[PDB]
Amino acid sequence: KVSITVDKDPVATSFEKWAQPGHFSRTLAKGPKTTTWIWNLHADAHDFDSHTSSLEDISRKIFSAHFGQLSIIFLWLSGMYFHGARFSNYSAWLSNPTAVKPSAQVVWPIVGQEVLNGDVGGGFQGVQITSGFFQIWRASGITSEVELYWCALAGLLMSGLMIFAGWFHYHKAAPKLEWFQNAESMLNHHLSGLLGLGCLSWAGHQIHVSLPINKLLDAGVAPQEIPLPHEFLVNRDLMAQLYPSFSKGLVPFFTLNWSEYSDFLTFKGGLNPVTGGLWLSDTAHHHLALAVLFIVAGHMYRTNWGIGHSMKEILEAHKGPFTGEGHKGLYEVLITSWHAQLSINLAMLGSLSIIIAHHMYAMPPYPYIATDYPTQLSLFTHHMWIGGFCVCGAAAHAGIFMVRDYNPAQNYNNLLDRVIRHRDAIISHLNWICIFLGFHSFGLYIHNDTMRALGRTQDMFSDTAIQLKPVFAQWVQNIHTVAPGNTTPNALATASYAFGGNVVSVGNKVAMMPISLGTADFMVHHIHAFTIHVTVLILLKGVLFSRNSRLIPDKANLGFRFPCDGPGRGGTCQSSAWDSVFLGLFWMYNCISVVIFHFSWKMQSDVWGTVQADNTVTHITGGNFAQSAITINGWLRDFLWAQASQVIQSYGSSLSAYGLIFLGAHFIWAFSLMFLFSGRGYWQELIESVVWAHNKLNFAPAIQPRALSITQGRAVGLAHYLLGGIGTTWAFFLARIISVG
Amino acid sequence: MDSNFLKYLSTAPVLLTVWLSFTAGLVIEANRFFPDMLYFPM
Amino acid sequence: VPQTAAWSAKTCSVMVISNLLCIVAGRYVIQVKGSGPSLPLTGSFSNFGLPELLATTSLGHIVGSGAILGLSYVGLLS
Amino acid sequence: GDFLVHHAIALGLHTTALILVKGALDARGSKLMPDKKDFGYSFPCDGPGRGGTCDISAWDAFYLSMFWMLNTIG
Amino acid sequence: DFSAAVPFLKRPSNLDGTLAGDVGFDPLGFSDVFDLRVLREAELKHGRFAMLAVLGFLVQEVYTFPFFPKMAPVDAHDYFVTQGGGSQIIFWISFVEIFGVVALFELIQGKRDAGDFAFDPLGLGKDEATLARYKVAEIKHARLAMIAIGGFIHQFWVTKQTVLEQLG
Amino acid sequence: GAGKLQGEGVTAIPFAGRPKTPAFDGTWAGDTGFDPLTISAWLDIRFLREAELKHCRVAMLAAAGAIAQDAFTFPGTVETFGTGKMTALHDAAVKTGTMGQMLVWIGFAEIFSTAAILQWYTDGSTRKPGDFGFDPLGFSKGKDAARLELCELKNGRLAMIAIGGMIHHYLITGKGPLE
Ligand code: CLA
Ligand code: CLA
């Protein structure tokens, strides 16, 4: 029976434990005999599975932590909306979106930092923003700072509601483990209610608010002259002027005469010629269809009334001759381990973020976002990074589940057991494929470099030489170009003009044009494959060998996160599944850096640019990519050296902040190498000398100073490495694109 | 005020944050009212 | 744009037949029944409960909408 | 500019000397491994026993001083 | 149980009728999750502000100080915001509220009664019977004035007319 | 409250028989053994009777109002709203803002109705469904007490169908209830 059961007043709200750091952990509650205790406090703060053995307690803690996170996100959104309302040039941007740079942050004039308040436009000077909030609001139909103030108020109220809910559901009414372990009910409700009703409500908002307001805005009506959303709601005649099918009413809907709504529910495709974004009338139909699909999908599982499925039955029924027991035990694993669920959800969320980055650039969904090049580049790279981090976290939590919550007794001859039992084959084959891809993807660049440096330019892998044409990708692009009217008969235009078609230009600037793939694209795609495969190798090898290996037969006893097993066996450094995540995070950084560099160069060289009166488009770099992206020297010179000029010549301008952050990120990246190349013994001995110096003056801390643990040193090195590298790329990208766009 | 809440305010990170925010405010206001002081005036 | 015909005896007949077909198919296919009484019917329809009626009618409406729209698309219904 | 780069060079010389002198003087022993001379000059480590003993050798002091010497000469 | 005020609503558990003006009205159950003493202090602070605001509205409509420009009570707000008198009033209310914070902490600790600031300059509440009657009257008037001040301000916003002039 | 008119032993559909749900114990009023679809086996009888009595009251007060509006129109309305009847009058009053104020105050009342309904499950309230204590002029405090409950339910059931018929007749002919 799916039912609600809670414990009333399980934990008393009191500050007693606020003054007892480490209370959650038995080893830490004692006190800080050394400085390692300080770091352990933070390292184990949110490891609820190591505080108690009670799945009920862990689930309640996770629920309340989720409520706190939602409150934080609502506060973040309210802050962005309030800044748009109060410290922004949103009205000027609405008046002239193609001339004034969006800005919603202003700095104070203290030490000359007022230089950062650049001339963005519209009689306003501030910090140019690249988050796309202006376009989000324009699509939503916001045309005033009053509406943004109300949005901020709603965000603040929701943040308060979320924090209150977290406190209430931890200290006043904490649901029980039976409540938590309702996968069927939790998926039915999420799918139908959350997703389906969310997209249904958004479809209603788009149909009643966004569509007419944006129709008038594209027609050129002034934002002050456009009527108000409630006016549109209550004046069916006014809305019937813009979309003449509202005079029909809901009778077509309830009689299945849905063609009557073709005026505002249309499968049009392409991009809005005026705004350069997707048709909001297409988005409304998209979201309505998604709402129907999700509400139907949310009626698949059994809750209380007999109708539905049981995921246990489905999984146990799905088994074959190559897999023995098949998916038996997975339902129990997933309703008894939070870490398995976290791994799955993180992997899917990260892959979704990557997919979102791709689709949000080839099909700009918001008005005037396509020609806002800083926004496009920033969003693409941001979501790529979030996706990579989420994937690495999925690997980490898969390893944590394997070490902690994996039970061979309950996993016998099922898929998990069989994977463990032939892990050697998987890792060996992935190793071979990684080496093969590395060779045949990077040795090609090395070959081109050597031939160009030897003057044998006819022996290179180039479009003007030996060719490596991505015929399959070109074939797919041709399919998508010809689909409108042939394989998608009732679609007027292609899904994206990147596949092929005509250039979409807004404000004498390219919004989206066909992206041509050649030898350089073939090479860079195969390098992407190489990097992804190596990252997967590291993460999967760690996860599979988390529990045991030929080297360390008892590794689960050591744990998920341990430094080593000593200098024996030749040396067992970094053998755990945590160190696998550490190295795989390095490799994810490599992969995503190459991906975002590819995007930046390709889009600046073959998509983005200004269209002349001739109809010809001159790109930001002008075809550099085809003949330069085939050599590492070409990447070093025509991309890094060439495009770093904007960030290194930013001093004295509003991008001087970008220049300073460029330098600081370089500093942090280098500073990471001190932790990454070094070991604990040297620093402990140096601390011994420093402690002697302190003792010579008859004083020294009661908390004995200690060098960072080995794992903590690796973590600090990795964190500083990632911060420095990503910050360098951040400053470089933002400075370059804001200078040339 | 609750003694436990006061101890929580006395904890090391809270005190460090408050003290360094106070110091940053001191320096910021000094530079706001007496800016561009590259030297001790003599 | 496809054609969606206005409400008519044909549309009503398609919807009704879809609902009846899905009710019978639900009787044959629904494995687990809920715990409660049954609608006052005897014989094959002796364990027909409300929730099962409601489910069969929901699927029947999905199928009826799909069939109506598709038959209008191909021009048979319209 | 010469003044500033000269003090950078002073920092580099002093830090390389710090690493090398510490390695030389702690080569025979430290509070962590008070019997290092028994293990010699270039042993890998002493294990994760006393909180971790990575790079606890005079050879490792040399290995780090070589990064610092490459930084200073650069 | 059922609340005396609302026969069909159960009497809130925290509301036992001890406090003045307690008729068992708490449909949304704020008393269940929040301290009833803190809520009563908020109620009485609000009510005292509202009663003084109603009296101020009426007295400002009939009379204004010779040294201040004559204007409607609502417009006086925006005027004094720029003039600087509003800043002074806010500062002094904040000064008193600084000690109000200490009073609230003492109330939480259980040393004080919510809304009891020991303020009887004229000694009008010395005898108990009269004191309880006065407390009931105070809470009743507080709630009524909380409603009435909102009525006054909104009616002025609609009609752009002072209440005295509107009533005719 | 007779056991022949209502209560156990009464069957509206003989070929089916009285349902076995809690609603048909014979204690709940207005029981004619009528539940072909068996909705009372899946929803709380308390919730269902609350909804039924709310519908009864609203439809028993709307029908009387339609008759009153067609017979006597209050002075000052026949001019302000116009001369539209029934649902046209609803539109006119919406424009006037009358219906908006009505909605605001009815929502204020329905908030406390929501609290009363929730208290069945949250705090285990024992309120009777549809019982608000509104008995100012005493009739429930007497012999005709259960006979007045049955009359209320029966007249509300009559009025629901009556108002449906009246609204549809107005939609077709354009005439009010009195035609
Ligand atoms: C901490 C990480 C982080 C941060 C800082 C940001 C920051 C940003 N995101 Mg977000 N985003 C993140 C993670 C993050 N994202 C992840 C992990 C995803 C994948 C789910 C997304 C997906 C996403 C989308 C699809 C969009 C943004 C957008 C934005 C920008 C506007 C913020 C906003 O209010 O958008 C408000 C967001 C919207 C109006 C669009 C919402 C549409 C999605 C599909 C709703 C999904 C909701 C659902 C419950 C999620 C679970 C799905 C799962 C069950 C399958 C901003 C730069 C917007 C942007 O780029 O604007 C120019 C934008 O359209 N983000
Ligand atoms: C939904 C997201 C999610 C959730 C709920 C969790 C939950 C958890 N993770 Mg994590 N994890 C995630 C995503 C997530 N993870 C991702 C994306 C990754 C990949 C990087 C990881 C990788 C990972 C590892 C490798 C490990 C965990 C562990 C844990 C557990 C304890 C973490 C802890 O105590 O943190 C407390 C919080 C901190 C210690 C703060 C860390 C923040 C660092 C210092 C960087 C912050 C920089 C910040 C952005 C500012 C930069 C700007 C600069 C100028 C200041 C906990 C169950 C640990 C575990 O289970 O061990 C048994 C563990 O070892 N996770």
Ligand code: CLA
């Ligand atoms: C006799 C009754 C009847 C008739 C005549 C039709 C006729 C039609 N229906 Mg159908 N339909 C019916 C009953 C009927 N339907 C019923 C009962 C239902 C309810 C389930 C539906 C539900 C339904 C939907 C939901 C849709 C149709 C559509 C259509 C029309 C276009 C379909 C097409 O050619 O797609 C050909 C399309 C393809 C070959 C491409 C399919 C690929 C998609 C885009 C992605 C799927 C990939 C997947 C995720 C991965 C592959 C599997 C993997 C394991 C390998 C067609 C005229 C479509 C329509 O109206 O379009 C305008 C439409 O969207 N019908």
Ligand SMILES: CC1=C(C#C/C(C)=C/C=C/C(C)=C/C=C/C=C(C)/C=C/C=C(C)/C=C/C2=C(C)CCCC2(C)C)C(C)(C)C[C@H](O)C1
């Ligand atoms: C904006 C602004 C300003 C301002 C301001 C100020 C001071 C604004 C103040 C607004 C106030 C005080 C609003 C009060 C609203 C009260 C309501 C709706 C009570 C409803 C009670 C009900 C329904 C009771 C019902 C009752 C109940 C429950 C139980 C008993 C029975 C029943 C009768 C039913 C200025 C003036 C400074 C100007 C400046 O430019 C900025």
Ligand SMILES: CC1=C(C#C/C(C)=C/C=C/C(C)=C/C=C/C=C(C)/C=C/C=C(C)/C=C/C2=C(C)CCCC2(C)C)C(C)(C)C[C@H](O)C1
């Ligand atoms: C205000 C307004 C509007 C409006 C409106 C309104 C107020 C609309 C109201 C509509 C109503 C009240 C409809 C009622 C329909 C009742 C039916 C069909 C009963 C069937 C009973 C049966 C089949 C019984 C069967 C059986 C049973 C159970 C028991 C006994 C045996 C038997 C009888 C055989 C609009 C829409 C015009 C719009 C306007 O802008 C604003």
Ligand SMILES: CC1=C(C/C=C(\C)CCC[C@H](C)CCC[C@H](C)CCCC(C)C)C(=O)c2ccccc2C1=O
């Ligand atoms: C430098 C270094 C040290 C010495 C560094 C220590 C002990 C760090 C102590 C730093 C202080 C206590 C932090 C506070 C001051 C910082 C300037 C503030 C930033 C840090 C907070 C944000 C946490 C190690 O102990 C170590 C151990 C293992 C591998 C590599 C290394 C390593 O590289």
Ligand code: SF4
């Ligand atoms: S201690 Fe340092 S060096 Fe010795 S094994 Fe562990 S990690 Fe490798």
